[PDB]
Each structure stands twice: as structure tokens, then as C-alpha cells.
Amino acid sequence: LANTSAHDFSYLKFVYNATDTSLEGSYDYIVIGGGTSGCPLAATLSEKYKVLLLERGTIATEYPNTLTADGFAYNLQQQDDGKTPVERFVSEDGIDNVRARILGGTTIINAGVYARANISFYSQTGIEWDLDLVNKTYEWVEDAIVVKPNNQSWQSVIGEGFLEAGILPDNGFSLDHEAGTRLTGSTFDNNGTRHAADELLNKGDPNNLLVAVQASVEKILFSSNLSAIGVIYTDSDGNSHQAFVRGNGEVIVSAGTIGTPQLLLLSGVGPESYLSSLNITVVQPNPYVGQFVYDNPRNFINILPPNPIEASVVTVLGIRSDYYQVSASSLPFSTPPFSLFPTTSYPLPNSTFAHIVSQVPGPLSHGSVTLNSSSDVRIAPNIKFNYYSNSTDLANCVSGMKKLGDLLRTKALEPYKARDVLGIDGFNYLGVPLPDDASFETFCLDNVASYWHYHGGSLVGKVLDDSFRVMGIKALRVVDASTFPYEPNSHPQGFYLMLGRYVGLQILQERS
Numbered sequence: 001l002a003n004t005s006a007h008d009f010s011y012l013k014f015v016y017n018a019t020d021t022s023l024e025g026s027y028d029y030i031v032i033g034g035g036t037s038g039c040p041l042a043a044t045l046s047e048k049y050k051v052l053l054l055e056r057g058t059i060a061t062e063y064p065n066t067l068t069a070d071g072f073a074y075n076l077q078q079q080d081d082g083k084t085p086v087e088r089f090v091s092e093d094g095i096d097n098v099r100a101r102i103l104g105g106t107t108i109i110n111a112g113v114y115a116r117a118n119i120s121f122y123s124q125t126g127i128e129w130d131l132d133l134v135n136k137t138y139e140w141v142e143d144a145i146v147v148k149p150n151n152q153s154w155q156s157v158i159g160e161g162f163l164e165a166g167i168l169p170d171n172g173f174s175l176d177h178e179a180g181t182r183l184t185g186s187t188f189d190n191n192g193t194r195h196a197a198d199e200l201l202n203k204g205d206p207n208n209l210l211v212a213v214q215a216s217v218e219k220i221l222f223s224s225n226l227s228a229i230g231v232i233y234t235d236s237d238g239n240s241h242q243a244f245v246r247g248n249g250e251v252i253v254s255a256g257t258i259g260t261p262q263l264l265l266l267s268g269v270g271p272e273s274y275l276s277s278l279n280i281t282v283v284q285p286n287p288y289v290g291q292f293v294y295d296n297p298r299n300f301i302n303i304l305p306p307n308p309i310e311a312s313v314v315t316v317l318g319i320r321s322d323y324y325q326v327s328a329s330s331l332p333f334s335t336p337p338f339s340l341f342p343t344t345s346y347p348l349p350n351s352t353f354a355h356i357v358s359q360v361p362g363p364l365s366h367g368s369v370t371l372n373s374s375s376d377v378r379i380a381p382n383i384k385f386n387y388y389s390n391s392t393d394l395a396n397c398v399s400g401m402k403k404l405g406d407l408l409r410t411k412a413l414e415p416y417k418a419r420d421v422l423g424i425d426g427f428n429y430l431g432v433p434l435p436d437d438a439s440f441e442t443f444c445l446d447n448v449a450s451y452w453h454y455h456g457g458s459l460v461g462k463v464l465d466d467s468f469r470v471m472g473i474k475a476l477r478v479v480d481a482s483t484f485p486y487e488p489n490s491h492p493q494g495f496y497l498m499l500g501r502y503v504g505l506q507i508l509q510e511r512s
């Protein structure tokens with residue numbers, strides 16, 4: 001595990017403005033998106049080869065509130081001016097959401113929770129994983145940026161509560177996704193400093209790795225034996241740039257669940273009928289690009305204790321097969337953190353509150369990503385998740401919401417009631433309190449938010465082979481959250497950080 005230490009920006013010595021035309025030319029690898037998977041991938045490939053990492057966002061030093069636990073709410077509260085580290089969007093379902101626009105990607109804006117994948121996930125995928133390597137790669141990430149969190153009074157309350165509510169066994173401190181109650185790792189250190197995927201660039205070879213920031217990759221370039229050969233990207237002034245791969249090199253798309261399918265569709269990789277209807281020339285027909293896009297539901301209640309509670313970052317997890325629960329305690333605010341609540345018309349708290357949540361696993365419900373613009377990558381694509389279109393997800397939210405009921409009934413939570421009455425109506429609620437089964441179904445459907453753990457759109461077995469290659473195209477891979485249809489665990493940053501380096505190692509091995 002990592003120590004308490006300042007955020008390591010040493011890698012800025014090889015970070016350049018995309019306006020610099022001397023970045024243009026040939027590389028062994030081009031990685032698109034300096035995010036959760038993309039940074040460790042680029043750092044790994046740079047051990048042996050010349051790598052260009054292209055990131056549309058700027059550097060995290062420009063937005064200091066990204067570098068502390070205390071800053072979490074600020075980045076969501078801040079207006080999206082097209083330059084900010086948080087990009088706001090609204091799914092076609094009507095649910096407010098965010099994605100990262102910064103070097104380090106969503107690890108620079110997220111809630112810091114670190115877990116390893118459910119050990120059953122690997123065999124469920126049917127990919128021939130090198131499981132020893134997976135574990136060495138987890139340790140490489142964890143050594144760099146993960147800590148054992150210190151005690152936080154709210155998280156200890158919630159852990160006592162989960163155990164009293166029957167979420168057993170007590171797993172103590174563990175990074176593993178396993179049934180029961182545990183303290184998990186965090187990418188916020190014990191001084192509250194955020195550590196993130198951008199610090200994994202410090203593991204790259206500074207003679208081999210170049211990073212362009214404010215680089216908007218607009219198109220993947222192909223050969224006239226179809227190969228990816230390069231990219232077109234534009235800089236912050238709007239001028240265009242080209243970079244290419246050479247010899248046995250490859251372009252990897254690491255632009256996230258939203259950005260990867262968007263760039264593939266803009267490049268003519270996607271469903272023939274759909275692309276044809278936009279007069280986009282088809283380079284590689286594939287009916288599944290931007291299909292099987294998922295967003296795990298977040299359902300929640302908010303309690304307002306009659307005495308102040310101390311704000312906390314989530315470290316204590318309550319895990320069952322059918323639901324994953326946590327709680328954060330928060331200061332009040334008069335500017336809402338965008339997407340914490342599903343719409344902007346949610347009532348504001350004006351005292352300290354506990355946000356107590358359950359996450360639907362999978363989920364089984366899915367939607368898609370489609371282009372809004374057929375040319376401009378800076379225009380966000382359309383995204384729809386179809387929350388609770390699958391009855392199994394609704395069934396699982398019902399079970400989760402019943403367990404949050406059990407949690408509000410524990411001795412652990414009894415001190416946070418406004419009235420010493422027998423029932424959970426003894427709490428004061430911000431928004432809709434918990435309510436047979438139909439009332440819980442209505443509550444699940446009506447009060448859903450994003451968990452922010454959206455995934456899919458470029459699935460292994462649909463768009464990619466078991467080596468993350470785009471089927472039908474040489475020298476093109478995708479490595480990020482677009483790649484799997486089901487969550488590897490409650491909190492997937494750990495899996496995607498691991499995946500970046502792991503796939504980089506598989507690329508270096510395939511080539512040796």
C-alpha cells in the first residue's frame with residue numbers, strides 16, 4: 001500500500017499543449033484518453049516503446065479542488081464551461097450525470113473508493129486471464145496510490161449498522177469484493193490528498209512517453225488488410241494535428257464508456273444501417289458499437305440528524321450478491337453537486353446529512369450511445385440507460401431498499417433519529433423517505449440516480465476479441481469501462497486501473 005504524500009506531478013516534465021506541432025509524427029503506440037485505464041496503459045507501453053497519450057482535458061493543477069477529499073463536492077457544484085474537469089450530461093432517461101474531462105480521467109473527480117474485482121469475475125468472462133499477473137498488477141497500482149483509510153466516525157457507525165442489519169460476515173479491512181461488511185482501500189490518503197491514475201504516468205519512461213493535453217481526438221485514421229494507422233486531433237485554438245503508429249504498433253482507445261463508442265462511430269466503425277443513415281462512410285460494420293451501455297442504479301435516502309455529524313469519504317461497504325450499500329456524511333450546501341441528486345429541482349439540505357445508498361448489481365437493463373453530431377467530437381453523444389427496463393434490476397432494488405430499512409432500525413443508527421419513537425419515522429429525511437412490494441417498486445422507479453459506474457458500448461465478445469482488439473481491424477484496441485457488460489465489483493476504478501497496465505503487458509508480450 002501507498003503512504004501519505006503530496007500528489008506526484010513529476011510527469012508534467014513530458015506533458016505538452018496539443019498546440020505544439022512537434023508532437024505530430026510517428027509513434028509505436030497512440031493511446032486516446034489519459035484516464036483510469038489510459039494512463040497506466042501508456043505508462044506500461046512506454047517501458048519499451050515510444051508512446052503518445054492524447055487527453056482532451058487539461059492538467060489537474062489547473063483545478064486544485066480535484067486534489068483533496070474536501071474538494072469532491074466543489075467539482076460537481078462548479079458550472080461546466082467546456083474546460084472544467086467535470087462534464088455534465090443528462091441521459092435520455094432524464095437522469096443527471098457527469099464524466100471526467102482531465103488528465104487522470106474519472107480518478108481525478110471520483111469518490112476515491114478502491115476495491116479489487118470479485119475473484120469470480122475472471123472465470124465468468126471466459127477470457128484466459130493470467131491471474132498471477134492480474135494480482136501483481138493490482139499490487140503495482142495499490143503500492144502507488146491506495147491507502148488503508150483511518151477511522152471516520154460516520155463510516156464506523158454505518159459499518160456497525162450493516163453488521164447489525166445482517167450484512168455478514170465482518171471482513172475487517174480488505175480490498176476484496178466479498179459478501180459482508182468491510183473497510184476497503186481509498187485513493188484519498190490519510191491527509192486527505194487525492195492520488196489518481198495521472199500519478200501512474202510517473203511509472204512511465206520519461207525518454208519514451210509524451211502526453212498532449214487539450215488534445216480532442218476527432219478521428220481514427222485507417223489504411224487502404226484494414227489497419228488503424230493514426231489519429232486526427234484538434235488543439236485548444238481549434239487547429240488540426242495528425243499522429244501515426246509505425247511498424248507493429250497500435251492505436252488504443254481509452255476514451256471511456258461515452259468517448260470510445262463516440263470516436264469509433266465518428267471513424268466509421270459501427271452499425272452499417274446507422275452509419276449509412278448519417279452518410280458516415282463505413283470502414284468496419286459492427287452492429288454493437290454504442291450498444292450494451294449500462295448504468296448501475298443508485299437509490300438512496302437522506303437523514304438529517306438532530307446533532308451535527310462529521311463529513312466522511314466512503315470507506316465502509318455492505319456487500320450482498322444482490323445489492324452493494326454505502327453511506328457518505330456531508331456538510332450542507334446551497335449549490336447542489338450536479339448529479340448527486342437526479343435532477344436540479346431536488347430540495348437542498350441546510351444541516352449535516354447522511355446519504356445512505358444501495359447499488360443494483362449488473363445491471364441487466366441496458367441502452368446505447370448514439371452521435372448527436374456526425375462530425376464534432378466536442379458535442380456530447382446521446383446516451384440512454386433504460387433504468388429498470390429489466391424486472392430483475394427492479395427486484396434487486398426492492399431487496400436493497402428493504403435492507404436500508406433494516407439498517408435505519410439498528411441500535412447503531414438510533415442516536416441519529418430526531419424523535420425517540422419506535423419507528424424509522426423517528427428520522428428527519430431530506431427528500432423521499434422509504435415507504436407488500438408495489439410501494440418499493442414505485443420508490444425504486446421514481447427516486448433513481450446514477451451510481452456513476454456506467455460501462456459498456458464496446459464489449460468484449462461484441463466489438464472486441466479476448467485481447468481487446470477491435471474485430472476486423474489490425475492495430476486497434478479498446479481498454480477502459482466500455483469493455484464489460486457487468487460491474488466487476490461495487491467500485492470498479494481498481495479493476496480499470498489494473499486493466500490498463502495488464503493489457504499493456506499483454507501487448508508487450510504478444511510483440512516479444
Ligand SMILES: Cc1cc2nc3c(=O)[nH]c(=O)nc-3n(C[C@H](O)[C@H](O)[C@H](O)COP(=O)(O)OP(=O)(O)OC[C@H]3O[C@@H](n4cnc5c(N)ncnc54)[C@H](O)[C@@H]3O)c2cc1C
Pocket residue numbers: 032033034035036037038054055056057098099100101102103104105106107109110111112113114115215216217218254255256257259260263377451452453454479480481482490491492493494496
Ligand atoms: C463522480 C464519480 C464518482 C465515482 N466514484 C467512484 C468511486 O469512488 N470508486 C470507483 O471505483 N469508481 C468510481 N466511479 C467510477 C469510476 O471512477 C469510473 O468508472 C472509471 O474511472 C472509468 O474509467 P475509464 O478509463 O473508462 O474512463 P475515464 O477515467 O473517464 O477516462 C477517459 C478519458 O478519455 C478522455 N477523452 C474522452 N474522449 C476523448 C477524445 N475524443 N479525445 C481525447 N480524450 C478523450 C476523457 O477526458 C477522460 O480523461 C465514479 C465515477 C464518477 C463519475
Ligand SMILES: *[C@@H]1O[C@H](CO)[C@@H](O[C@@H]2O[C@H](CO)[C@@H](O)[C@H](O)[C@H]2NC(C)=O)[C@H](O)[C@H]1NC(C)=O
Pocket residue numbers: 118119120121124177178179319320321322
Ligand atoms: C461475485 O461474482 C460471482 C459470479 O458472477 C457471483 O456468484 C453468482 O451469484 C449468483 C447469485 O448469488 C448465483 O446464482 C450464481 O450462480 C453465482 N455464480 C458463481 C460462478 O458462483 C457472486 O454473487 C458475486 N459475489 C458478490 C458478493 O457480489
Ligand SMILES: *[C@@H]1O[C@H](CO)[C@@H](O)[C@H](O)[C@H]1NC(C)=O
Pocket residue numbers: 017018019058059213214236237
Ligand atoms: C495551450 O495553448 C493556448 C495558447 O495557444 C492556451 O490558450 C491554452 O490555455 C494552452 N493549454 C494548456 C493546457 O496549456
Ligand SMILES: *[C@@H]1O[C@H](CO)[C@@H](O)[C@H](O)[C@H]1NC(C)=O
Pocket residue numbers: 116119131132135176
Ligand atoms: C489473487 O488475489 C486474490 C485476493 O485479491 C486471491 O483470492 C486469489 O487467490 C489470487 N489469485 C491468484 C491466482 O493468485
Ligand SMILES: *[C@@H]1O[C@H](CO)[C@@H](O)[C@H](O)[C@H]1NC(C)=O
Pocket residue numbers: 277278279
Ligand atoms: C445522405 O446523402 C444523400 C445524398 O447522397 C441525401 O440524399 C441524404 O439526405 C443524406 N442524408 C443525410 C442524413 O445526410
Ligand SMILES: *[C@@H]1O[C@H](CO)[C@@H](O)[C@H](O)[C@H]1NC(C)=O
Pocket residue numbers: 371372373382
Ligand atoms: C442533441 O442533443 C440534444 C440535447 O441538447 C437533443 O435533445 C437533440 O435531439 C440531439 N440531436 C441529435 C441529432 O441527436
Ligand SMILES: *[C@@H]1O[C@H](CO)[C@@H](O)[C@H](O)[C@H]1NC(C)=O
Pocket residue numbers: 364365389390391392
Ligand atoms: C433481463 O435480463 C436477462 C439477462 O439478460 C434477460 O434474460 C431477460 O430477457 C431480461 N428480462 C426482462 C424482464 O426483460
Ligand SMILES: CC1(C)OCc2cc(C=O)ccc2O1
Pocket residue numbers: 072073111314326327328329330337340355357
Ligand atoms: C455515496 C456518495 C454518493 O458518495 C459521495 C458523496 C459526496 C457527497 C458530498 O457532496 C454527498 C453524498 C455522497 O454520497
